[PDB]
Structures are given as structure tokens and as C-alpha cells.
Amino acid sequence: KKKRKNPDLGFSDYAAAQLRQYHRLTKQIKPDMETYERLREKHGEEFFPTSNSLLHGTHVPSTEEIDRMVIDLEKQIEKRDKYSRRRPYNDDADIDYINERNAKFNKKAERFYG
């Protein structure tokens, strides 16, 4: 059995959050060594190109593949859509604001003047 934890911190740079998300997505993927070997026995030495070494024009993908990336796109898009968790419209406390822009400005002022 296995165990780990990862706590959230400051967004410090957009890079940090991006990196966390990449970690998760990367861990998810599971590759088929079948297709890997199939692709391998055709091309051989072309498999291991340096930045500058080797070249074959284009690798054309079966559509079924393309569907995988499209699906992952939609998933990540949703997960990103949920970035900001909204606090429910609570009327219970005292109202001094005149509109929602004013309500939010009063909230930002509450953070900076204690």
C-alpha cells in the first residue's frame, strides 16, 4: 500500500501552479509499450534524435488518438473553469455597499485596513 500528500501554498508564480498541474496530468498518463514497439520496429535509429540530428517530415496521427488529447483538453478546461470558488450570497451580515462592485471594493478595503 501507498501514501503521500501535497499541500497547497501561495500561487507564487503562475509557473508554480502550471507545474503542479503538469505533475498531476503527467502522473495520470499510462502508455502502451505495444504501440511503442510497433512504431519502433518501423523506424529504429530515427527514434533517438538529438535536437539537431534527425528528420522525418511529419508523423500523421490516427484520429482515435486525436480524440484522446481533445478529451483531456475538455477535462483540463473544466478543472480550470473552477479556479475561483465563489462564496454564497449571504445577506445575513450588515449591508453598507450600494452595488456588487462597491461590495467587493469594501471587501478589499477590509483586507488592507485592520
Stretch that binds other proteins, among 38-46, 53-61, 73-81, 89-97 (CB under 8 A): 89-97
Q: Is 48 in the site for other proteins (CB under 8 A)?
A: no
Question: What is the grid cell recorded at 20?
Answer: 503542479
Report whether 43 contacts 56 (CB < 8 A): yes
Among 26, 50, 90, 99, binds other proteins (CB under 8 A): 99
Residue found by looking up cell 502502451 in the block: 32
Under the binding rule (CB under 8 A), the answer on residue 101 touching other proteins is yes
Q: Measured between alpha carbons, how far apart are the two ends of the chain, in Å?
A: 48
Segment holding 79, helix H or strand E: helix 63-81
Q: 51 vs 99, which CB is nearer to other proteins?
A: 99
Select from 22, 36, 47, 97 the one that contacts other proteins (CB under 8 A).
Answer: 97
Site for other proteins (CB under 8 A): how many residues?
A: 15
CA–CA separation, 55 and 93 (whole Å): 66
- Chain residues that interact with other proteins, rule: CB under 8 A: 94-99, 101-102, 105-106, 108-110, 112-113
